[PDB]
Design a protein around this ligand. Structure first.
Ligand SMILES: CCc1[nH]c2nc(Sc3cccnc3)nc(OC)c2c1C=O
Length: 366
């Protein structure tokens, strides 16, 4: 509806607006986000990161490979177009685009494999400096995008990549993609890692809580969907040592301010505690349970993968997609019920505990 294309001068002259200027970690994030799009779209399964001793970063993936076709209107390869311009848009007047990286880099290189050609192009301070050419050939099914870049010292407090932060980030990302394998190679500290979580979130709560949780084997929703689309979640009840694990994600973007997906998980848990209480007549007469009680001592991680993530206001901190709320709800209800119906011992230990919670709340009302 409103598409906006500009040059890179805005970014160059307000870096703090388009990246965190402490170090290049964010620049790397932006490129991982792009690989991650291909992983979410189902075309990619690898993201490989090398940190070189010259302080450049290289991020590679086995995705479809950045487009190379000449834009009928802009007269320029897809890849050049994305690289040498800010793209933005909306309905009326991060996800800032890789051209931010290009801009704040002294040198950036891209190597693409599509259609059995290997393409190459170099840029400097965000301007093309060597034409897109075919430098090799490759099997038709050998595809991907590979970018290496030399952040430009003048923009950053420090050019040194904060290593620990990146590794944490990469671990966080793999956990949320059982289909993804992330290799990482720091040539400066001579160290390599590989993350592959075939298992998924399974174990994470066990590990991060290491207290007695209920259920003892926290509840897994493994890759539930319908094409509306994808729910992974893990949850259990526990108690304090301030061990708040309450994490939520859309398309791997942290939602520190919750929304439709979180709401959805709150409802469906309630929904199926109500339904289970009634089914077995586990009521007590002046203890009407509420949605908040079933949630009070809940520890969880919910990660949602959806086609059109609409957010709240200016930043991508809260998910506002009306209708994930009932997509997350229906699943958690049915899914949890089945477990409840099969788990007398723990299902009733859970209800009794939520009753204590509601009971204690009702008391505090004078
Ligand atoms: C390694 C990082 C990366 N990996 C990428 N893979 C694709 S594949 C694709 C994307 C959109 C349309 N057609 C193909 N496209 C991209 O740019 C749009 C990137 C990309 C951009 O930085």
């Amino acid at each position: 509806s409103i598409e906006v294309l500009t040059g890179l001068d805005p970014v160059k002259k307000r870096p703090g607006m388009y990246t965190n200027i402490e170090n290049p970690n964010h620049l790397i994030q932006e490129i991982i986000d792009n690989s991650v799009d291909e992983v979410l779209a189902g075309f990619a399964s690898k993201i490989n990161i090398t940190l070189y001793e010259d302080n450049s970063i290289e991020v590679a993936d086995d995705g479809r490979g950045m487009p190379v076709d000449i834009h009928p209107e802009h007269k320029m390869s897809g890849i050049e177009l994305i690289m040498t311009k800010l793209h933005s848009g909306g309905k009326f007047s991060h996800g800032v685009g890789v051209s931010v990286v290009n801009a704040l880099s002294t040198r950036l290189e891209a190597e693409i494999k599509r259609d059995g050609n290997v393409y190459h192009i170099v840029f400097e301070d965000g301007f093309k400096t060597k034409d897109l050419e075919i430098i090799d050939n490759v099997g038709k099914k050998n595809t991907g995008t590979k970018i290496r870049f030399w952040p430009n010292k003048k923009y950053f407090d420090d050019i040194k990549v904060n290593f620990k932060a990146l590794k944490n980030l990469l671990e966080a990302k793999a956990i949320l993609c059982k289909a993804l394998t992330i290799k990482y190679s720091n040539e400066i500290k001579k160290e390599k890692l590989t993350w592959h979580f075939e298992t998924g979130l399974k174990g994470y709560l066990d590990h991060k809580l290491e207290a007695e949780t209920l259920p003892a084997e926290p509840f897994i929703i493994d890759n539930f969907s319908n094409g509306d689309s994808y729910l992974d979640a893990v949850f259990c009840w526990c108690e304090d040592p301030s061990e708040s694990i309450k994490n939520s994600y859309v398309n791997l973007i942290p939602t520190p301010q919750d929304g439709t997906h979180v709401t959805g998980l709150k409802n469906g848990i309630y929904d199926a505690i109500k339904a289970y209480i009634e089914k077995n007549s586990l009521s007590v007469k002046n203890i009407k349970i509420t949605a908040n009680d079933s949630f009070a001592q809940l520890n969880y991680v919910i990660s949602v993968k959806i086609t059109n993530p609409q957010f709240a206001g200016q930043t991508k901190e809260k998910l506002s997609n009306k209708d994930v709320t009932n997509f997350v709800a229906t699943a958690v209800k049915d899914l949890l019920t089945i477990w409840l119906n099969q788990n007398p011992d723990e299902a009733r230990q859970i209800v009794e505990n939520i009753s204590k919670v509601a009971q204690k709340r009702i008391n505090a009302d004078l």
